[PDB]
C-alpha cells in the first residue's frame, strides 16, 4: 500500500475513534523508512497515545480495586490476574512504539525540533512502562526514561526558543516524570516553573503559527504547579 492511502485511513480512523486502526496505518507508514512529515508524526503520536492510554487507565482502575478488596477476601487473585493481562498489553504497545523510535524515527530525524520530539516520545513511553514496572525492570525503564528526556532537554536548551511548544511540552512531561516516577516534588516544580518563567520572559516571541500550542502548554505547566502546591 502507498503512503497517501494509509494517511487517509489514519485520518478517518481518528475521527471514528478507532485508534487500533489508526495506529496500524501509521505504523505501516513509519515502516516504509522515510522521515515523517509533521502531519504524519502527529497522527502516529495521537494514535499510540490513545491505544496505550486505554491500558494506562484500565490498569489504574484495576490496581485500585485490587487494593480495596481484602487479602482474606481472596477475590483479588482475579484482580491480580486481570491487572497482569492489562500490564502485558501495555508493555507490548510500548515495545512497539519504542521499536519504531529506535529503528526509524530517531535515526531519520534531520532537524533538532524533530530529534527532541522523538526523544521526548521515547521518554514518555519508558515513563508509561515505569508506571507499572517493578524490581530491576523498573530500575531499567526509569533510567531509560530519564536518559531520553535529558538528551532531549540538552538539545532543546541549545536549539529551541523557550516559547517553542516542543520545548515547553518536554518540560511539562519531564517534570511529571520527576513528580510521579522519581517522587521528587522539588525537582518537578523547579523544572516546570523554570520552563514557564523562561517562556513568560520571552512572551513577545510568540507568533500566529505557534501562540495557541505554546500558551496551551504554559497553562498546563501552571495547572500542574497549582496541583503540586495545593499540597
Amino acid at each position: 500500500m502507498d503512503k497517501s492511502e494509509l494517511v487517509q485511513k489514519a485520518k478517518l480512523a481518528e475521527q471514528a475513534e478507532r485508534y487500533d486502526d489508526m495506529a496500524a496505518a501509521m505504523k505501516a507508514v513509519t515502516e516504509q523508512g522515510h522521515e515523517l512529515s509533521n502531519e504524519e508524526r502527529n497522527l502516529l503520536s495521537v494514535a499510540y497515545k490513545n491505544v496505550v492510554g486505554a491500558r494506562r487507565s484500565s490498569w489504574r482502575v484495576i490496581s485500585s480495586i485490587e487494593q480495596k478488596t481484602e487479602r482474606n477476601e481472596k477475590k483479588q487473585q482475579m484482580g491480580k490476574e486481570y491487572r497482569e493481562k492489562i500490564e502485558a498489553e501495555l508493555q507490548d504497545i510500548c515495545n512497539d512504539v519504542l521499536e519504531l523510535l529506535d529503528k526509524y524515527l530517531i535515526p531519520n530525524a534531520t532537524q533538532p525540533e524533530s530529534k527532541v520530539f522523538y526523544l521526548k516520545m521515547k521518554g514518555d513511553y519508558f515513563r508509561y512502562l515505569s508506571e507499572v514496572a517493578s524490581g530491576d525492570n523498573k530500575q531499567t525503564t526509569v533510567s531509560n526514561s530519564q536518559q531520553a528526556y535529558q538528551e532531549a532537554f540538552e538539545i532543546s536548551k541549545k536549539e529551541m526558543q523557550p516559547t517553542h511548544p516542543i520545548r515547553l511540552g518536554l518540560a511539562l512531561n519531564f517534570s511529571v516524570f520527576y513528580y510521579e516516577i522519581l517522587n521528587s516534588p522539588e525537582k518537578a516544580c523547579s523544572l516546570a516553573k523554570t520552563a514557564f518563567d523562561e517562556a513568560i520572559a520571552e512572551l513577545d516571541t510568540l507568533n500566529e503559527e505557534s501562540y495557541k500550542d505554546s500558551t496551551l502548554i504554559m497553562q498546563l505547566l501552571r495547572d500542574n504547579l497549582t496541583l503540586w502546591t495545593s499540597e
Binding site: 487507565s57 489504574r60 514518555d124 508506571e131 511540552g169 511539562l172 512531561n173 511529571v176 513528580y179 510521579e180 502548554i217 498546563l220 495547572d223 500542574n224 496541583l227 503540586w228
Partner: peptide
C-alpha cells in the same frame, strides 16, 4: 489525590 495513584481529576497533565 496522589497523582496517577488516585482518581483522574488529580492526574497531572502531559502532552
Amino acid at each position: 489525590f496522589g497523582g496517577i495513584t488516585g482518581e483522574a481529576e488529580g492526574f497531572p497533565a502531559t502532552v
